Assembly symmetry: D2
Homo-oligomer: 393 residues x 4
């Protein structure tokens, strides 16, 4: 272990501050003072803290109340040294957002949600956050006829392009990151996966400052490969932030500690974030943010334990993934399997489509039957990663 601030472990206020109310029960923990949250996080080794507006400032707060709270909050940041790398807005708890924020059927709620966002953009800039996250949790429906699907996407576009144009207009040094979720709280949430998220950004006017904030558990709620999806975000140069946690299967969003869900996928998620790609290419250099929830069965000693464990898990995993790629038998296993070979272009420098068709040895005279003999040896290579992860090698 021993996470140190250069590791860039940032934690949201709502993670450790999560009191335990689930769908079937009330909170099992007393509320957590934000100032207390800041001092405890800094003591554990974190680099920063993130928050939703209503996490710090009540929806009812008066102007006088908002400044009291921000003073104490800012003093704490000051006393401890934590940064505030990401800020986000609550567009899901208050009953007003029951049909969404940006894509609410009610036009007056669309405006109210957008004005909440713009003001929150001002606070984000004021705190020094470089990313503004957007989790559209109530954008969706339970029933397919509830919405005009085309208009729901035009209304989502309007909100995001209005917010973006405002960032550019003010010259805040902020980027927007969308956070996909397939379901919960809605039956079907719009932009349910990384692909949808990614595709949507490409139809925006201000797409240049809009990227994604994928969350392990969310892609895993659709049965998808999380590494595969973050790989694709990075390859598109849209992986602006990340939420790390654990999910055991397709069920409700569990938000477990990172590594307490699909352990082998967490191993390869850490290999991509730390090591990047076998043949070279992009790297993710932002914060390693944890969006989890301390199990409701545990008191406050598990709250700080769970926070410690996230960081532990990531450095345990980082350690084995460094050892793994550095190991000469793994590097040779990779060469046998064709990992480096995929890096070579298919076409020879200069060869046209007409050329290759017409190249007798690639088609006409190709021995297909002989190329099929090849042992890719992907099982042996999988076995080498598991043994490294198991601490055996």
């Amino acid at each position: 272990v021993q996470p140190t601030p250069a590791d860039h472990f940032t934690f949201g206020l709502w993670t450790v501050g999560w009191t335990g109310a689930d769908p079937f029960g009330v909170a099992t923990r007393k509320n957590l003072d934000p100032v207390e949250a800041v001092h405890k996080l800094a003591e554990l080794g974190a680099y920063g803290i993130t928050f939703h507006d209503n996490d710090l400032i009540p929806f009812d707060a008066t102007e006088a109340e908002r400044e009291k709270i921000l003073g104490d909050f800012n003093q704490a940041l000051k006393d401890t040294g934590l940064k505030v790398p990401m800020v986000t807005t609550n567009l899901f708890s208050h009953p007003v957002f029951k049909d969404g924020g940006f894509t609410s059927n009610d036009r007056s709620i669309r405006r109210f949600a957008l004005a909440k966002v713009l003001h929150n953009i001002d606070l984000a800039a004021e705190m020094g956050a470089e990313t503004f996250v957007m989790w559209g949790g109530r954008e969706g429906s339970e029933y397919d006829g509830s919405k005009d699907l085309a208009a729901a996407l035009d209304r989502m576009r309007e909100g995001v392009d209005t917010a973006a144009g405002y960032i550019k207009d003010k010259g805040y040094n902020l980027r927007i990151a969308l956070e996909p979720k397939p379901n919960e709280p809605r039956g079907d949430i719009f932009l349910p996966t990384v692909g949808h998220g990614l595709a949507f950004i490409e139809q925006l006017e201000h797409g240049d400052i809009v990227g994604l904030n994928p969350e392990t558990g969310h892609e895993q709620m659709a049965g998808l490969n999380f590494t595969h999806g973050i790989a694709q975000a990075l390859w598109a140069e849209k992986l602006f932030h990340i939420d790390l946690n654990g999910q055991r299967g397709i069920k409700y969003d569990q938000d477990l500690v990172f590594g307490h869900g699909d352990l082998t996928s967490a191993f390869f998620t850490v290999d991509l974030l730390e090591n990047g790609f076998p043949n070279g290419g992009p790297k993710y250099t932002g914060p390693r943010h944890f969006d989890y929830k301390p199990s409701r069965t545990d008191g406050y000693d598990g709250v700080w334990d769970s926070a410690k464990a996230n960081m532990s898990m990531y450095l345990l995993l980082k350690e084995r993934a460094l050892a793994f790629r550095a190991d000469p038998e793994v590097q040779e296993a990779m060469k046998t399997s064709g990992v480096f070979e995929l890096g070579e272009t298919t076409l020879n420098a200069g060869e046209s489509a007409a050329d290759l068709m017409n190249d007798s040895a690639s088609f006409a005279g190709f021995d297909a039957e002989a190329a099929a003999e090849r042992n890719f040896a992907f099982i042996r290579l999988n076995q080498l990663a598991i043994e490294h992860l198991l601490g055996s090698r």
Copy 2:
């Protein structure tokens, strides 16, 4: 019923020609002669037939054999009147494609798969097909370390941009459509959903002639809303073709008759294809193609029955969805729920982001508590669609 050629029911050769070998057993039906397939489809009311290259022409076929087969095939098209609207290539059965076609770790297989594609592009143009589909079924992995994820996407890009540039170079009146699948035959298939498919097309050089071919069962294998996904393809103006079928849940690709899977989703899938969007916008005007498989428990009388049923189901559904939107109580229910209200822009013509923030009634003086009272009445509206579908109204 009574499907007529203007309905645009096109069927693949491999649907009705599917003999029954699954993972746990051999074929239960005798092979189906393609000429026989053409005459039977035309008799039933179809408009066209589609095929994979190896569906018609064996992988081993000599040049002399290829022309014999094409003569008889073309005479049949001629005798009956069917069009050939889409053509696709087999890059998954032969053992050579065990690690993929375009994204195979072996460079010699990448070339062989790409040269198979280019030649098949020539046949597609020769047959009069307007769409060339690409289902990347072996592109993926069972293990996360098997591939360099960034290089897998560069190699997928190369194949698609090489094929596209060839279409533009020859001036074929062809468009490429990608077909997403989350898994099977691979543990994880690249571009697993519509979003991923959509996002990927945006990184291509020749993205203008590349669109999607979503399949009901495939999105449903990730737990997604199929209408939601095709809505998004259409909104992006990338819904170039469609595969309709049935899937009961997250399991292996079942390929049931359209309507024998999630019936309520098929109702709204047909409402979007036929009716489009409540407030106006894009429409899909291509073929209604069926990518299904006759259950292996049934003989050839079920083969033609299953083919009849697909078309029946779609016209039964079309009928109720027309009645549904035309019904004045449904239109008023829609108005109560805010379906038309979502169509209005959030911002007043001319209002800037600064203006609305600063507009006291949208934020500062907004009564959130009062806007939350609103009864959206989405349950009543769902009940009106189910009763219309049930033939009750």
Copy 3:
């Protein structure tokens, strides 16, 4: 279609009284007065009402308070004529229950939970209820090492046999119904499916008065077929009560209106409740109970609408399901497919194993390839079911 008391439609107080509180937001509706719930449902068509101890009597209610509430509810019931066929205990909302009631790791908690069940049996008996339902929703774990799983079942058993022993001793005309759920609120719940519930019941000292309370959506959360699951419960004669609602996939417990999820599965569930088994066999006679939640987007008009919609859906399905088996064409299809042949014992009267292996026509000289030619025509029987469901027939 109009519900009458003879339909045996029952509703829980928690269903129409569901305030809207979910994991990402607060109540969207005011609390429902029990008196008013009773009256309202009485005019809707309801047969009876069901409740949880704490739905009616607050956890901390004083004796005076308890008495008042009880006199008010009992008044209501007398006035409207509503029966109280099932009563259940809330062993999941209070923080004390965070690790379970019956299978909590803490022994004082387990005794409290059992005390709370015993007292509730008394109330259930004073109310005239025939069923006592146990939904062990906090019984399970998030983590695999948190429980001694053999010991979790012994503790489950101990509690259930203690509750059963007490019924028998007291002369109460009550049976216990266990209710499975695979996950949520815990990551994994003990006795997750109908299969697991039936199995556990056979290990009980008093399993004669312990049966199942299967819920539509719960079986669909592990992707199982509801209809197959209650068919095994019925066959074993352990289908004591039933919970009808809708679920649209493997995700959080949606609790939609019955028929508002998987429509074809709903139709076939109705077919099984109403027509029983094609070759005869046991038949379900209890209440048709709905455990659903009016979506939180709808106000109180929506609550009664949705309640109305449950009985409406069931009746519509029933009408279609009786039209389907009454249909001669459907009966022809049934004979062809071997539906009635299934009910014919495989052996002949007094034929042993030895006699069968020795019968030459049965094995040694059986023409397997010729038997494999049968066209089951299952596709066509399913098209006929769907056509009856759509009311196109």
Copy 4:
């Protein structure tokens, strides 16, 4: 870690002999000679081999042929010393079996399938096998009206009790093990989970010699916890055999190498096979059998590698799992969390229901808010398990 015959590792002939044929492609490897399978596994560390009647003896084999094959296999076995602990029947590949064997709608097919099972019992007994496994993979439907579900179970029962009756009559030292699977090849399979298998067994005339053969991947296909499922089988004393492999999610039956799926679930399965229950209870003693498939991308070096990898994974996990319970710190955590408190009966010796409801300290005066303060510290016990699994401890 090196396997020895004392480890009881068993492998099926169909596993390492799996040729590569899947639903979208052909065999990628040549057929395996049985003789060679035997020899190879013998040098790997295997305890024994298992097979299906038709893995060894072709369906259409003449008597001369059958005898030859049997003499060759029996030779092999003698030469290498390999035991044959389980034998099973293939009632799924031939077209005759398309609607089931035991629960086919056609009555002559059901008699053939039962004849084929009886004859196979004989062979199983001549081979010295202790277990006779029934995997009813064609027993089920795609469509809900295709079967009389009460009648499907009676037919299942009839076949299983007939097979059991014959064992008893013959004096054979054999027990039957049923093997659940939720879907695939059929859309829905009868007796889909461990729960459903245990339930069915209690309705049998001869259930004393009928138990379960749970497969890791099969329970994970309905998203259930393997470890909880074999824990109920063990508790009921019905865990007769086990099939270990890996599955990475709710999708087609992957049949990966044991530990190559859900790693933490594998570790806890190993912990349960090796350490049994924390408070004591029954213990599994049979073979540790692997029913997996060498990925089709790998050639024959890959087949033996993957076989090797199964025993390798199990041993590595075992080493870690014995280190974990041996650890004092882990034992401390266990006591704190209430793992040993769970094993303590809830009632006191000879305390009745009445005595409990009447005990004031247990209910009336229990301090529920004070009991709710306990910090179970389940997160920390799970971090300790993971840290032992990673070998960082």
